[PDB]
Amino acid sequence: MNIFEMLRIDEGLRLKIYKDTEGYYTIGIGHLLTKSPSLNAAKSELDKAIGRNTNGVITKDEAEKLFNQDVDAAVRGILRNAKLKPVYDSLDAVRRAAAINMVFQMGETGVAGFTNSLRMLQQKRWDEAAVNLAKSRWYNQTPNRAKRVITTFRTGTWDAYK
């Protein structure tokens, strides 16, 4: 298992524009297009992202290309962030994947707001971080996915994904 397979499980793959759990136009493997309620705005963000006239449908290769860029962007967002970077550097490889998963889902600023959780993660207080992580809109809105990510931070294993 790895970050790619982990996010593929958590996000799924859809080849036609869909609404994500928040109601936002999304495509592929959790690639958010726009927060605007306009499907036309989505389609135009999508043509721009793919570089051709898609009319709201993309191939699997194209979904996987966006996915690669988004995993890459999430890692870079962590490394460029003063609050995220030192926690990430402190983590083993499995728990680093949980951090990328979170940034992917909610962005760099969202995650950087888990101030107390970040500190407990840095100190390797795993059970306490896990309790704190769960007290969040994140966990209440997407409990199954959040439980999987939390268990990964808690145990440092891929058990929640097998």
Q: Which residues contribute to the site for Cl ion (CB under 5 A)?
A: 49, 142, 144-145
CB 26, CB 18: distance < 8 Å = yes
Q: What is the nearest approach in angstroms of Cl ion to the Cβ of residue 34?
A: 11
**Residue 87 or 99: which CB sits closer to Cl ion?**
99
Q: Residue 105 or 117: which CB sits closer to Cl ion?
A: 105
Nearer to Cl ion among residue 44 and residue 142 (C-beta): 142
Annotated binding site for substrate: 32, 104, 117, 132
With respect to Cl ion, which residue has the nearer C-beta, 95 or 145?
145
Residues with catalytic function: 11, 20
Whether the CA torsion 118, 119, 122, 123 is positive or negative: it is negative
Positions at the binding site: 32, 104, 117, 132
Q: What's the distance, CA 150 to chain centroid?
A: 13
Q: How far is the CB of 157 from Cl ion (least distance, A)?
A: 20
Burial 108-130 (b: 16+ CB within 10 A, else e): beebbebeebbebbeeeeeebbb
Per-residue tokens: 157: 């294993």
Please give the residue whose beta carbon sits closest to Cl ion in the complex: 145
